[PDB]
């Protein structure tokens, strides 16, 4: 059992969950700077 710490000091399956949500939130925000063929991308301008 003592050897277990040496193998740690693996958890990529846990980091992938964090990465997948961070990437969807970074993409969702970036998609606001798109004109989609309009004159501008800002509803006040």
């Amino acid at each position: 059992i003592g050897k277990i710490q040496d193998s740690l000091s693996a958890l990529g399956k846990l980091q992938d969950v964090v990465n997948h949500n961070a990437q969807a939130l970074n993409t969702l925000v970036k998609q606001l700077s798109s004109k989609f063929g309009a004159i501008s991308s800002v509803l006040n301008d």
Binding site: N26, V29, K30, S33, N44
Partner: protein, 49 residues
């Protein structure tokens, strides 16, 4: 409105240092988060309300 920059938020004293030609700053994802007052030349953060 800072000479064209239109927005809403709370203005507070900042601790950033612009280069001596830059008016305003943006954060990651390209949204304005700091401006410089044209008259007093001080950097102010813009936080959402």
């Amino acid at each position: 409105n800072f000479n064209g920059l239109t927005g809403t938020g709370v203005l507070t004293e900042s601790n950033k240092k612009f280069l001596p030609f830059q008016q305003f700053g943006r954060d990651i994802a390209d949204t304005t988060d700091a401006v410089r007052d044209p008259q007093t030349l001080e950097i102010l953060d813009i936080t959402p309300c």
